[PDB]
Amino acid sequence: GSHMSELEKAMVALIDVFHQYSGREGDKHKLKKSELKELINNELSHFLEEIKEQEVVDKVMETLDNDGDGECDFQEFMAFVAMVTTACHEFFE
Amino acid sequence: HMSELEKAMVALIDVFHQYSGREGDKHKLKKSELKELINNELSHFLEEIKEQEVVDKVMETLDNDGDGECDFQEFMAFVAMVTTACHEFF
Amino acid sequence: GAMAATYSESSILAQRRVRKLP
Ligand SMILES: [Ca+2]
Ligand SMILES: [Ca+2]
Ligand SMILES: [Ca+2]
Ligand SMILES: [Ca+2]
Ligand SMILES: [Cl-]
Known part of the structure; x- marks a missing residue:
């Protein structure tokens, strides 16, 4: 339709x-x-366990980081979102 | 108290x-x-699809297990592609 | 109308720890 869709929003x-x-x-x-x-x-306090250990954030960033700069750009963040959403869906079957 | 990201x-x-x-x-x-x-649902971001050839190309790109259809995991890849492309034009 | 032509361990860990409801 002409309104911004739920998807687009x-x-x-x-x-x-x-x-x-x-x-x-x-x-x-x-x-x-x-x-x-x-x-x-x-923001993911219902989907992911809280992070309070440094060892953890180290491991998460390593997996998300494909260009090897130690940081997460938007493309890499979208991959992360894709991954998490897939998991919640999986826990709805 | 569910978040914007989660919604x-x-x-x-x-x-x-x-x-x-x-x-x-x-x-x-x-x-x-x-x-x-x-x-x-994506009319403000993507140009309308009018041709079958285009539908075909899109599905072929998205379909990673070769069943001609698109499951959720394959759809999420689509949302990432698209969302990433828009982020770059904003 | 800015549109494209349509041709363009730790996560299991943080999803497993999502345990609640006694
Ligand atoms: Ca920053
Ligand atoms: Ca990076
Ligand atoms: Ca498929
Ligand atoms: Ca169907
Ligand atoms: Cl489903």
Whole structure:
């Protein structure tokens, strides 16, 4: 239809929450481990277990990081979102 | 107190369930269902799809297990592609 | 109308720990 769809508004919400956290420290277009952690603990508090150990955020970032800069760009973050959403769906069958 | 990010994720599941459920396999998107999703729900981001050839190309790209249809995991890859492309034009 | 032509361990860990409801 002509209204922004639920789908289109979801996509927009993804962009906004990323820039909401990536903009805090250092590079505003990437999530340092610092920023990724805060995102997970505050916004995925129903899907993912809270992160409080440093060993954990290390491991998460390693898997998300494909270009090897130690940070998460938007493409990598979308991959993360894809992964998590797939899991919640899987826990609805 | 569910978050914007989580609500957004749930809507992805919901929009998939809506279109996959119309025809055929109620858990997968066939070409026609995929095309309607793009024309009905992604009309402000993607150019309308009018040709079958294009539907074909899109499904071939998305279909990683070779069954001619698109499951949820294959759809999420689609949402990432698209969302990433838009992020780059904003 | 800015549109494209349509041609363009730890996660199991944090999803397993999602345990609640006694
Ligand atoms: Ca940053
Ligand atoms: Ca990176
Ligand atoms: Ca179907
Ligand atoms: Ca498939
Ligand atoms: Cl489902």
